[PDB]
Amino acid sequence: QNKLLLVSFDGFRWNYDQDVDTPNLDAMARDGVKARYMTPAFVTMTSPCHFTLVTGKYIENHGVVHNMYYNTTSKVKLPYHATLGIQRWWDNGSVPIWITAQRQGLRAGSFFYPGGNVTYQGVAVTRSRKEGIAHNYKNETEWRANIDTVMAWFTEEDLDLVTLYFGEPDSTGHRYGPESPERREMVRQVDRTVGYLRESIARNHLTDRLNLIITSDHGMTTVDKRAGDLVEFHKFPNFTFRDIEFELLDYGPNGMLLPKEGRLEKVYDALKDAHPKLHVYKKEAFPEAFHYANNPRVTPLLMYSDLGYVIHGRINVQFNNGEHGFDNKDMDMKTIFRAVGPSFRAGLEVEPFESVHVYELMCRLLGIVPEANDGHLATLLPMLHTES
């Protein structure tokens, strides 16, 4: 059997390599497989999309419906890092790939990967590392060290699967924007890390025994501040926050709302036409194609805004130049799928696919029985060599 290394670079847009010199990614395209682009799950958030990659399920089905743990009764809203340690958020009836693999005699590890630092139905990941609260995500010397550690897990601790997470270029994209020179310098750093990764695989004699997947969770688009028709809840005339019991706003282009008892119809009629670029739905009427709304955790009202626009609640508190979370049909939200290894063909480009199919692939690559999921293995199977 071959080992598996899945690497994710947060917020790597499908065409980030097109206006940057990416020698190592280009080589990996020659030596392996590439998707024209990969369509992420909706919502296009970090944690929900990452969990889809390791469960093969749409977001409504695995239950991680937001970067933030929230609780409508207690009114708690925990940011991304804190939520990485809330077990009940991730252990909601779906089983990520580490746990499935370990029940079938494999050893699996998570390095900074969302959902990998908690237990599922009482089981823990064989090896797990979680970053600090104020972690620095762009330190290249730290990147190379983490790869060294992951390599030791493969060789010294007889691990078969590792999921390794990097917080760039999402961080740099957010701060300076996806079209900035800073982003491109960060993509250049990523590309150097791809080469270090492949060189580290060869140095450890795993080139012919280890399959490598390099992907991401979503893309990134610019937020124009020059635009004037901002989505501001505090400027909706016939709407009042007096009708809201719980709210989740001021977080990119996705919002949720739980009105006080009996005021749901009042709030809805106020907001359904409030802004031509804010699409508000009753939970039942939210588009099925998104595969997002039908989860008990989602609130009776949810909404999303058009590309380039974020949702402002009581007061504007968002200043990022780039954002994600938008419609997964938007090209700017599309992301990458790259892979190389003994089981993978070479020089192959495939038409786009949804990220929900990565799970079935990884399970076939590990020779394990997949949990029931929303993907289909026939989608990505052309990527693999025919056996003899």
Ligand X SMILES: *[C@@H]1O[C@H](CO)[C@@H](O[C@@H]2O[C@H](CO)[C@@H](O)[C@H](O)[C@H]2NC(C)=O)[C@H](O)[C@H]1NC(C)=O
Ligand Y SMILES: *[C@@H]1O[C@H](CO)[C@@H](O)[C@H](O)[C@H]1NC(C)=O
Ligand Z SMILES: *[C@@H]1O[C@H](CO[C@@H]2O[C@@H](C)[C@@H](O)[C@@H](O)[C@@H]2O)[C@@H](O[C@@H]2O[C@H](CO)[C@@H](O)[C@H](O)[C@H]2NC(C)=O)[C@H](O)[C@H]1NC(C)=O
93 binds ligand X (CB under 6 A): yes
**Both tokens assigned to 243:** 């009708």
Let me know: does 201 contact 210? Beta carbons within 8 Å.
Answer: yes
Residue 142's binding partner, choosing from ligand Z, Na ion, ligand X, none, with beta-carbon cut-off 5 to 8 A by kind? ligand Z
**Both tokens assigned to 95:** 């089983």
Which of 39, 46, 52, 55 is flagged as catalytic? Answer: 46
Residue 22's binding partner, choosing from Na ion, ligand X, Zn ion, none, with beta-carbon cut-off 5 to 8 A by kind? Na ion
Residues that bind ligand Z (CB under 6 A): 136, 139, 141-142, 145
The residue number whose beta carbon is nearest to Zn ion equals 46
CA angle 133, 139, 141 (to 5 degrees): 125
* Residues β-bridged to residue 254: 304
Let me know: does 32 contact 203? Beta carbons within 8 Å.
Answer: no
Maximum CA pair distance of the chain? 69
Of 124, 230, 307, 350, which lies in the binding site for ligand X, with binding defined by CB under 6 A?
Answer: 124
Q: With contacts defined by CB under 6 A, name the span among 124-132, 158-166, 180-188, 209-217 that binds ligand X.
A: 124-132
**46 in active site:** yes
Residue 63 or residue 169: which is nearer to ligand X going by CB? 63
**Helices marked H in 305-352 — which ranges?**
none
Residue 7 or residue 95: which is nearer to ligand Z going by CB? 7
128 binds ligand X (CB under 6 A): yes
**DSSP reduced 3-state for 60:** helix
**Interface of this chain with ligand Y, residues 57 to 86, rule: CB under 6 A:** 71, 73-74
Of 11, 40, 63, 325, which lies in the binding site for ligand X, with binding defined by CB under 6 A?
Answer: 63
Q: With contacts defined by CB under 6 A, name the span among 113-121, 194-202, 216-224, 230-238 that binds ligand X.
A: 113-121
> Taking the CB of residue 175, how many other CB atoms lie within 10 A of it?
14
Tokens 């106020």 belong to residue: 270
Residue 70 or residue 111: which is nearer to ligand Z going by CB? 111
CA angle 73, 83, 179 (to 5 degrees): 120
Helix, strand, coil shares of the chain, percent, nearest 5, are 30, 20, 50
User: Which positions lie near ligand X, rule CB under 6 A?
Assistant: 63, 92-93, 117-119, 124-125, 128-130, 296-297
User: Which positions lie near Zn ion, rule CB under 5 A?
Assistant: 10-11, 46, 170, 217
Residues annotated as catalytic (active site), given as ranges:
46
